[PDB]
Amino acid sequence: SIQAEEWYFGKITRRESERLLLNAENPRGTFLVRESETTKGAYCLSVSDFDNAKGLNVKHYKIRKLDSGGFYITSRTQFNSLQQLVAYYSKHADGLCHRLTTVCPT
Numbered sequence: 001s002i003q004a005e006e007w008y009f010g011k012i013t014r015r016e017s018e019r020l021l022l023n024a025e026n027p028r029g030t031f032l033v034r035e036s037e038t039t040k041g042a043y044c045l046s047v048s049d050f051d052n053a054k055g056l057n058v059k060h061y062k063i064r065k066l067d068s069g070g071f072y073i074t075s076r077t078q079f080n081s082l083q084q085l086v087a088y089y090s091k092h093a094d095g096l097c098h099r100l101t102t103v104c105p106t
């Protein structure tokens with residue numbers, strides 16, 4: 001049950017995710033998972049990033065879920081659960097702006 005996860009913000013808008021993530025106290029990789037506003041059955045992994053060029057900013061990645069079971073951002077790298085996906089991306093940046101580090105405070 002992803003709804004039991006503390007990083008699962010459920011039905012919140014993209015703008016709301018950005019308001020929460022754009023807090024100066026948030027280090028790179030602060031994140032949350034929410035429902036996509038318009039992509040049915042897909043979730044959105046919203047992540048904070050920071051650099052001298054752009055300063056504090058937010059990226060959104062789409063998490064696809066197959067009825068076949070797996071969860072993924074890229075079909076080449078799938079997981080048996082959303083929790084396993086979050087755990088993988090907390091260790092690897094791969095194509096993301098930063099590895100997942102801290103659950104976004106409300």
Ligand SMILES: CCc1ccc(NC(=O)P(=O)(O)O)cc1
Nearest residue numbers: 013014035036037038039044060
């Ligand atoms: C109109 C085309 C359209 C396609 C996808 C999105 N996705 C969302 O905004 P999300 O970032 O909550 O997933 C928005 C517009």
